[PDB]
């Protein structure tokens, strides 16, 4: 649908090793090595032996007959309106046949063209003469097309995608034509109906891939652009903290435990000389209710961690300098119920938030390299207004603080 | 319309009809419309308080709001006589009564808690209904059970009165922030009731979390609080034939689904589609069976007691009693298949009702009746709060301290008038206690009230002269110690700047309190405070790699819904000019599956206090899937 990108010559990529010529998915009560659902060529996620990613693609050989390139069918259709009629057997060359069309394609393309409307399409067909005819059809990995296991009374249920039903069908049509070497005696070519339906089936398979792109394949990539779902993330309400530096904040017990769960378990396993599974059991107990022991490990972690224990605090919309700020975890709260982040009042103006019950997003940073790079967003670095180079009033004393200093000096 | 000339004030003089929710707001003429609409929203956002009190400064419509809000109290609509009492549980029971005039037979149900929605609910004071005995007549307008808002004479209170002073406490009271004494926070206590449903299928079993080896208890008992915030844990089995991991039955596992809540369960309702023999044979159902039997006993009893009434010739039965009797009879009858969500369910479904007294916590929002908003920043000991010293009012402690800056900007002057009125009233109370006979005390009271509200003064004189001397003495002591009633009607009947001026000038002895460590003199006066629904728990989110649909169904302790990073966030990060690090964080946290697995492993196997992660440069899983599909299409990227 109006997309321009490089085309692929399947013969160059064709591999005899990854060849799917068997339409039966199962052989002798096990997944067929040559079948459409083949553990041999695509692999199995459970066993490590597969060593094969989804990128693995199977191959099919349609020789000695060629089919129209599925992606280019609409472009050919606009140039040649009789393509649908010609391929089937029932203008002057109406219903000649696919093989006859293949031999006479250059004559037919010149015969059926719009001088003004389809000149651009005709030039593209001249550019891609080699890619018009397709001898090899790709079949994507069975890992992508799942078969959900279910029990059936007649037989164990095989779940298939709407496309998967088509896949086994497509292989069957070509299989019969090749088996016969001398059988046809030239008396009657019935191969054209088998090839004809196949073109539509592959085209609908191509349309299904478009629907598969709609079904969470390219869309999920667009979901990341719309919103990448970051694990190791938290949200907390903001409450004022006094008595700690501007960069340091107070983080709740539950927030730190989950965000630093894997960091915490490493310490617990080493200190008690216990297995990680056993260490997880202690972490589960601490999350349920406040225990001094887990608080002590967390207190040691924030004090001794290299680069400090730091995170990113963003108030959305993130439209201004200082909307995301690099901050430090100064203290961990000892009240399980208290789930409010303690921030300095000076940070508030840059963030643009208020202590009205709104929540700010917490993105912890772990790698020491990232901490230094993200420290360029720290409050101290933003003390200088980037517009003027002057001091930033957002980080200055606020209403309550100004009054005390004013009473002191004036 | 453009013309507002249609409104004529003389028509509405002496009438409060144009006010609705603002009928609960004193001195409403002085409060801005914005603050008033915020107050109207807050009234709906308010939560029930255990120790609610009638306001010291009241509009006199509050009690009416209690009467016409039928959700909080049960009032009889006819004279009744107690026929019998039947118990399902110690906490929940039913009382069968007969109208002494009509003869119609009705029933009343008693339970400790009322569920509203989500976690919101309130406890019941069931003293009267428990007091009622067999062959005891229930009068026409008696209140059988009431909410904590209503008092002995059914006066209505939606908040508690707390001593307030406008003071700058270490800058903690910044913007809308409040600091509270621990006792005052004890006064702001709410109830929370939760209904949690555990569904156990035929092959599913409940772990022995609450029981020993001899006695199998997989869930708390009717009088027992939840332990470790786990009500029960369900283990799903494909077949249940082996039952071989008996030692693993007591233990808990990651695969097992745990249900989380906190509080005392007060009622359990079990709906069973399983044959009794299957429950009896297997030990793990024993606890369930007992409670099931308990229900059955109750049901059978009611049928036996009421069968003659229902099928008898008189048949003077209420529709409510008829439907209850029919439901119990349905339970006892065989071949009753219970359905949930229009489908027959395997095993049984249990509903737990859990009641917990929730205290005030940091981040909770409490406010007054004048549109002001406040967030509880700190809870501090009573001694740490401003305490006036070396006076007749010595040792008075401030329950709440509020930000002084911006009070006039808010356009809600009435809160100050309430505080000041209760402060001058404190002076009047101490003056009455200090000297005079009872007659002198009532005279001072009448003088102050005439200065505030004349109608209240006349009615107060009627009440005082009506009381006998013993009753008068009790009323006087109550006024001295508990507080002083002051009536400030919302629009017509309120005091103003000039009237407060007269109050201060006539009582020349009244001046600000000088507190212990405060150079500035302060005013400490009682303000009505209400607790709002908002709490920090509602919006809390925490995520670790491994929407939270379990949390909504109580299968997860807290929400694990991930935070979303977008183009704006990526640009703000790109301010650093280190795009590679942003891509590393994005791929390790989200985009790249291999990198995220590596990050987890490195975090758990690396140095505890040193975290340096090396992430492989590999195509993302999304990239692999995209490359596979495009090659099937026949298209490949060139000159990337």
Tell me how far apart the alpha carbons of residues A174 and A61 are, in angstroms, rounded to a whole number: 9
Tell me how far apart the alpha carbons of residues B217 and B346 are, in angstroms, rounded to a whole number: 21
Tokens standing for residue B86: 């039947």
Tell me how far apart the alpha carbons of residues B185 and B176 are, in angstroms, rounded to a whole number: 17
CB contact under 8 A, B362 and A400: no
Asked if residue A361 lies in contact with residue A235, where contact means CB atoms within 8 angstroms, the answer is: yes
Q: Which residue has the tokens 């255990």?
A: B50
Smallest CA–CA separation between B182 and chain A, in Å? 15
CB contact under 8 A, A259 and B634: no
Cα–Cα–Cα angle for B575, B580, B582, nearest 5°?
A: 55
Query: How many residue pairs bridge chain A and chain B with CB atoms within 8 Å of each other?
Result: 292
Tell me how far apart the alpha carbons of residues B124 and B392 are, in angstroms, rounded to a whole number: 41
Tokens standing for residue A388: 């003027």
CB contact under 8 A, A55 and B534: no
Cross-strand pairs, B530: B367
Tell me how far apart the alpha carbons of residues B411 and B403 are, in angstroms, rounded to a whole number: 15
Comparing CB atoms, the residue among B405, B543, B573 nearest residue A232 is B543
CB contact under 8 A, B541 and A357: no
Asked if residue A329 lies in contact with residue A256, where contact means CB atoms within 8 angstroms, the answer is: yes
Q: How was this structure determined?
A: X-ray
Q: Which of A255, A357, A370, A233 is nearest to A302 (CA)?
A: A255
B409 class by beta-carbon count within 10 Å (0-12 exposed, 13-18 middle, 19+ buried): exposed
Chain B hits for A345, CB-CB cut-off 8 Å, are 171, 174
Q: Which of A344, A321, A348 is nearest to A331 (CA)?
A: A344
In terms of CA atoms, which chain B residue is nearest residue A280? B254
CB contact under 8 A, A234 and B542: yes
Q: Which residue has the tokens 């039955």?
A: B249
Mutate to test the interface with A, among B182, B189, B358, B362 (most CBs of A within 10 A): B362
Tokens standing for residue B57: 């400064």
Tell me how far apart the alpha carbons of residues A23 and A34 are, in angstroms, rounded to a whole number: 8
CB contact under 8 A, B362 and A239: yes
Chain B hits for A224, CB-CB cut-off 8 Å, are 586, 590-591, 622
Chain A hits for B551, CB-CB cut-off 8 Å, are none
Tell me how far apart the alpha carbons of residues A316 and A329 are, in angstroms, rounded to a whole number: 21
Chain A hits for B180, CB-CB cut-off 8 Å, are none
A318 class by beta-carbon count within 10 Å (0-12 exposed, 13-18 middle, 19+ buried): buried
Buried b / exposed e over B257-273, threshold 16 CB at 10 Å, is bbbbbbbbbbbbebbbb
Tokens standing for residue B29: 């003429």
Comparing CB atoms, the residue among A70, A359, A362 nearest residue B539 is A359
CB contact under 8 A, B174 and A69: no
Long-range contacts (CB closer than 8 Å, 24 or more residues apart) made by B482-485: B483/B56, B483/B161, B483/B422, B483/B425, B483/B429, B483/B526, B484/B56, B484/B422, B484/B425, B484/B428, B484/B429, B484/B445, B484/B448, B485/B56, B485/B58, B485/B456, B485/B460
Measured in degrees and rounded to the nearest 5, phi and psi for residue B253 equal: -135, 165
CB contact under 8 A, B228 and A289: yes
Q: What is the DSSP letter of B64?
A: H
Tell me how far apart the alpha carbons of residues A363 and A382 are, in angstroms, rounded to a whole number: 19
Instruction: Identify how many contiguous H helices and E strands chain B contains and give both numbers.
Output: 18, 25
Q: How far is CA B113 from the centre of its chain?
A: 12
Cα–Cα–Cα angle for A353, B547, B590, nearest 5°?
A: 80
H helices present in B237-284, as ranges = 246-250, 276-281
Alpha-carbon distances of B581 from A146, A366, B372, B569, rounded to whole Å: 35, 12, 45, 14
CB contact under 8 A, A233 and B562: yes
Q: How far is CA A52 from the centre of its chain?
A: 18
Comparing CB atoms, the residue among A225, A285, A304 nearest residue B567 is A225
Tell me how far apart the alpha carbons of residues B179 and B185 are, in angstroms, rounded to a whole number: 10
Helices B414-434, B497-506: inter-axial angle, 10-degree rounding: 20
Chain B hits for A361, CB-CB cut-off 8 Å, are 563
Tokens standing for residue B568: 């704006």
Chain B hits for A377, CB-CB cut-off 8 Å, are 572-573, 575-576
Three-state DSSP class for residue B230: strand
Q: After which residues do gaps appear in chain A, with C to N over 2.5 Å?
A: 90
Tell me how far apart the alpha carbons of residues B118 and B236 are, in angstroms, rounded to a whole number: 27
Measured in degrees and rounded to the nearest 5, phi and psi for residue B35 equal: -65, -35
Taking the CA of residue A30 as centre, how many other CA atoms within 13 Å lie in the half-sphere pointing to its CB? 4
Comparing CB atoms, the residue among A6, A232, A403 nearest residue B638 is A6
Tell me how far apart the alpha carbons of residues A101 and A218 are, in angstroms, rounded to a whole number: 36
Chain B hits for A7, CB-CB cut-off 8 Å, are 634-636
Assign residue B532 a region (left: φ > 0; alpha: ψ between -120 and 50; beta: otherwise). Answer: beta
Q: Which residue has the tokens 């300098």?
A: A321
Q: Which of B143, B146, B142 is nearest to B122 (CA)?
A: B146
Chain A hits for B611, CB-CB cut-off 8 Å, are 263, 305-306, 366-368
Comparing CB atoms, the residue among A218, A239, A367 nearest residue B611 is A367
Tokens standing for residue B124: 């019941």
B117 class by beta-carbon count within 10 Å (0-12 exposed, 13-18 middle, 19+ buried): exposed
Tell me how far apart the alpha carbons of residues B242 and B219 are, in angstroms, rounded to a whole number: 23
Chain A hits for B175, CB-CB cut-off 8 Å, are 354-355, 399
Q: Which helix (H) or strand (E) holds B459?
A: helix B454-466
Smallest CA–CA separation between A85 and chain B, in Å? 24
Asked if residue B111 lies in contact with residue B91, where contact means CB atoms within 8 angstroms, the answer is: yes
Q: After which residues do gaps appear in chain B, with C to N over 2.5 Å?
A: 546
CB contact under 8 A, A262 and B175: no
Asked if residue A328 lies in contact with residue A308, where contact means CB atoms within 8 angstroms, the answer is: yes
Tell me how far apart the alpha carbons of residues B354 and A213 are, in angstroms, rounded to a whole number: 47
Q: Which helix (H) or strand (E) holds B95?
A: strand B93-99
Tokens standing for residue B157: 């209170």
Q: What is the DSSP letter of B26?
A: T
Buried b / exposed e over B362-389, threshold 16 CB at 10 Å, is bbbbbbbbbbbbbbbbbbbeeeebbbbe
Cβ atoms within 10 A of the Cβ of B464, count?
18
How would you write chain A as a 3-class SS string? Answer: CCCCCEECCHHHHCCCCCECCCCCCEECCEECCCCCCCCCCCCCCCCHHHCCCCCCCEEEECCCCCEECCCCHHHHHHHCCCHHHHHCCCCCCCCCCHHHHHHCHHHHHHHCCCCCCCHHHHHHHHHCHHHCEECEEEECCCCCCCCCEECCCCCCEECCCHHHHHHHHHHHHHHHHHHCCCCCCCCCCCHHHHHHHHHHHHHHHHHHHHHHHHCCCHHHHHHHHHHEEECCCEEEEEEECCCCCCCEEEECHHHHHHHCHHHHHHHHHHHHCCCHHHHHHHHHHHHHCCCHHHHHHHHHHHHHCCCCCEEEEECCCCCCCCCEEEEEEEEECCCCCCCEEEECHHHHHHHCCCCCCCEEEEEEECCHHHHHHHHHHCCCHHHECCCCCCECHHHCCCHHHHHHHHHHHC
Tell me how far apart the alpha carbons of residues B91 and B267 are, in angstroms, rounded to a whole number: 7
Task: Kindly compute the dihedral angle of the four CA atoms of residues A175, A181, A184, A190, in this order, to the nearest 10 degrees.
Answer: 20
H helices present in B482-565, as ranges = 497-506, 549-552
Whether residue B260 has a cis bond before it, omega within 30° of 0: no
In terms of CA atoms, which chain A residue is nearest residue B615? A367
Chain B hits for A355, CB-CB cut-off 8 Å, are 174-177, 375, 377
Whether residue A317 has a cis bond before it, omega within 30° of 0: yes
Cβ atoms within 10 A of the Cβ of B71, count?
9
Tell me how far apart the alpha carbons of residues A309 and A248 are, in angstroms, rounded to a whole number: 10
Buried b / exposed e over A103-127, threshold 16 CB at 10 Å, is eebeebbeebbeeeebeebbeebee
Q: Which of B562, B439, B440, B432 is nearest to B484 (CA)?
A: B432
Chain A hits for B621, CB-CB cut-off 8 Å, are 54
Cross-strand pairs, B321: none
Q: What is the DSSP letter of B589?
A: I
Chain B hits for A265, CB-CB cut-off 8 Å, are 604
Tell me how far apart the alpha carbons of residues B236 and B205 are, in angstroms, rounded to a whole number: 7
Q: What is the DSSP letter of B469?
A: H
Mutate to test the interface with A, among B376, B540, B591 (most CBs of A within 10 A): B540
Tell me how far apart the alpha carbons of residues A367 and B606 are, in angstroms, rounded to a whole number: 12
Sign of the torsion formed by the C-alpha atoms of A296, A299, A300 and A301: positive
CB contact under 8 A, B581 and A374: yes
Chain A hits for B634, CB-CB cut-off 8 Å, are 7-8, 10, 69-71, 131, 138
CB contact under 8 A, B609 and A139: no
Comparing CB atoms, the residue among B542, B581, B631 nearest residue A369 is B581
Smallest CA–CA separation between A71 and chain B, in Å? 6
Comparing CB atoms, the residue among B545, B611, B636 nearest residue A231 is B545
Cβ atoms within 10 A of the Cβ of B594, count?
15
CB contact under 8 A, B176 and A355: yes
Comparing CB atoms, the residue among B405, B611, B633 nearest residue A399 is B405
Tell me how far apart the alpha carbons of residues A29 and A32 are, in angstroms, rounded to a whole number: 9
In terms of CA atoms, which chain B residue is nearest residue A404? B171
Q: Count the helix, strand and coil residues of chain B and give each as a percent rounded to the nearest 5.
A: 35, 20, 45
Tell me how far apart the alpha carbons of residues B388 and B385 are, in angstroms, rounded to a whole number: 10
């Amino acid at each position: 649908m109006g997309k321009k990108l490089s085309l692929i010559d399947f013969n160059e990529i064709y591999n005899e090793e990854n060849l799917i010529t068997r339409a039966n998915p199962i052989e002798n009560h096990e997944f067929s090595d040559d079948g459409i659902y083949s553990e041999r060529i695509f692999g199995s996620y459970n066993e490590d032996d597969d060593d094969k990613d989804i990128d693995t693609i199977g191959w099919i050989n349609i020789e000695p007959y060629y089919i129209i390139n599925p992606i280019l069918f609409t472009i050919i259709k606009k140039c040649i309106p009789s393509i649908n009629k010609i391929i089937n057997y029932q203008g002057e060359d109406d219903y000649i046949g696919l093989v006859k069309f293949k031999d006479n394609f250059d004559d037919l393309l010149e015969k059926y063209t719009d001088k003004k409307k389809y000149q651009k399409e005709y030039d593209f067909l001249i550019e891609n003469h080699d890619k018009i005819f397709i001898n090899k059809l790709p079949v994507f990995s069975h890992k992508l097309r799942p078969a959900t296991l279910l029990t059936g009374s007649k037989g164990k249920v095989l779940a298939f995608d709407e496309i998967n039903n088509y896949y086994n069908f497509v292989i069957e049509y070509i299989n019969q034509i090749n088996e016969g070497v001398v059988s046809d005696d030239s008396i009657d070519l019935l191969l054209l109906p088998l090839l004809y339906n196949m073109q539509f089936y592959a085209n609908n398979i191509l349309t299904r891939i478009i629907s598969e792109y709609l079904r969470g394949k390219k869309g999920f990539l667009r979901k990341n652009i719309m919103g990448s779902r970051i694990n190791f993330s938290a949200r907390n309400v903001i409450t004022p903290l006094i008595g700690h530096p501007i960069d340091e904040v107070a983080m709740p017990y539950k927030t730190f435990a989950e965000l630093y769960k894997f960091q915490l378990i490493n310490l617990i396993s080493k200190v008690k000389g216990i297995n990680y599974n056993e260490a997880l059991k202690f972490w589960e107990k601490g999350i349920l209710g406040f225990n001094q022991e887990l608080y002590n490990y967390m207190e040691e972690l924030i004090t001794k961690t290299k680069g400090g224990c730091t995170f990113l605090l963003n108030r959305n919309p993130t439209i201004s300098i200082g909307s995301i700020l690099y901050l430090k975890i100064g203290l961990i709260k000892k009240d399980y119920k208290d789930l409010t982040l303690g921030i300095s009042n000076n940070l508030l103006s840059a963030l643009s938030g208020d202590y009205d019950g709104d929540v700010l997003n917490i993105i912890p940073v772990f790698d020491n390299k990232m901490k230094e790079h993200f420290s360029l967003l720290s409050p101290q670095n933003f003390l200088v207004d980037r517009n003027n180079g002057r001091f930033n009033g957002d980080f200055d004393l606020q209403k309550d603080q100004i009054l005390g200093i004013f009473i002191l000096n004036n | 319309m453009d013309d507002i000339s249609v409104i004529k004030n003389e028509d509405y003089e002496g009438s409060h009809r144009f006010l609705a929710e603002e009928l609960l707001m004193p001195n409403a003429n002085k409060t801005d419309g914005n603050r008033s609409t915020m107050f109207c929203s807050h009234l709906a956002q308010a939560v029930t308080l255990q120790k609610a009190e009638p306001p010291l400064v009241y509009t006199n419509f509050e009690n009416q709001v209690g009467k016409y809000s039928t959700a909080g109290y049960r009032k009889a609509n006819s004279n009744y006589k107690v026929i019998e009492k039947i118990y399902k549980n110690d906490y929940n029971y039913v009382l069968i009564v007969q109208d002494q005039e009509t003869g119609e037979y009705t029933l009343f149900e008693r339970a400790e808690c009322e569920f509203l929605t989500e976690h919101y609910g309130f406890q019941w004071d069931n003293d009267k209904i428990d007091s009622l005995k067999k062959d005891d007549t229930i009068e026409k307008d008696t209140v059988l059970y009431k909410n904590t808002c209503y008092d002995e004479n059914m006066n209505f209170g939606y908040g508690v009165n707390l001593n307030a002073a406008y003071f700058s406490y270490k800058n903690e009271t910044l913007e809308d922030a409040i600091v509270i004494s621990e006792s005052a926070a004890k006064k702001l206590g709410t109830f929370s009731v939760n209904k949690v449903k555990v569904s156990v299928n035929t092959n599913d079993i409940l772990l022995n979390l609450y029981g020993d080896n001899e006695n199998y208890k997989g869930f708390p008992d009717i009088g027992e609080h939840i332990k470790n915030q786990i009500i029960a844990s369900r283990r799903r089995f494909d077949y249940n034939t082996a039952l071989y991991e008996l030692k693993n039955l007591n233990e808990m596992r990651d695969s097992d689904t745990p249900f989380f809540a906190d509080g005392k369960i007060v009622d359990i309702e079990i709906f069973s589609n399983v044959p009794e023999e299957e429950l009896k044979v297997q030990k793990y159902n024993e606890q369930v069976l007992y409670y099931i039997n308990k229900q059955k006993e109750f049901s059978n009893n009611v049928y036996q007691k009421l069968k003659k009434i229902v099928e008898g010739k008189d048949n003077n039965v209420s529709d409510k009693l008829l439907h209850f009797y029919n439901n119990c009879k349905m339970r006892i009858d065989e071949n009753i298949s219970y359905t949930y969500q229009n489908s027959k369910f395997s095993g049984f479904i249990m509903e737990f009702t859990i009641l917990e007294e929730e205290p005030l916590n940091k981040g909770s929002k409490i406010t007054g009746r004048y549109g002001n908003k406040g967030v509880i920043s700190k809870i501090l000991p009573d001694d740490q709060m401003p305490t006036v010293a070396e006076g007749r009012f010595k040792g008075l402690k401030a329950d709440i301290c509020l930000n002084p800056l911006g009070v006039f900007n808010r356009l809600n002057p009435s809160q100050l008038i309430e505080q000041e009125l209760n402060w001058i009233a404190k002076f009047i109370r101490k003056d009455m206690e200090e000297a005079g006979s009872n007659e002198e005390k009532v005279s001072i009271l009448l003088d102050f009230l005439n200065r505030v509200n004349k109608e209240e003064t006349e009615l107060m004189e009627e009440f005082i002269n009506s009381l006998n001397k013993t009753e008068l003495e009790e009323f006087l002591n109550d006024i001295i110690e508990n507080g002083i009633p002051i009536c400030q009607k919302p629009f017509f009947g309120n005091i103003g700047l000039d009237e407060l001026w007269e109050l201060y000038n006539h009582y020349d002895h009244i001046d600000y309190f000088k507190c212990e460590g405060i150079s500035t003199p302060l005013i400490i006066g009682e303000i009505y405070m209400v607790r709002l629904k908002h709490e920090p728990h509602s919006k809390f989110s925490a995520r670790s790699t491994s929407k939270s649909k379990n949390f909504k169904e109580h299968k997860d302790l807290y929400s694990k819904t991930p935070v979303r990073i977008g183009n704006m966030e990526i640009s703000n990060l790109s301010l650093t000019n280190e795009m590679g690090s942003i891509m590393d964080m994005l791929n390790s946290y989200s985009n790249n599956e291999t990198n995220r697995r590596e990050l987890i492993m490195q975090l758990l196997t690396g140095n505890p206090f040193d975290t340096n992660i090396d992430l492989s440069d590999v195509e993302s899983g999304t990239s692999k899937i995209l490359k596979s599909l495009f090659t099937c299409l026949g298209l490949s990227i060139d000159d990337v």
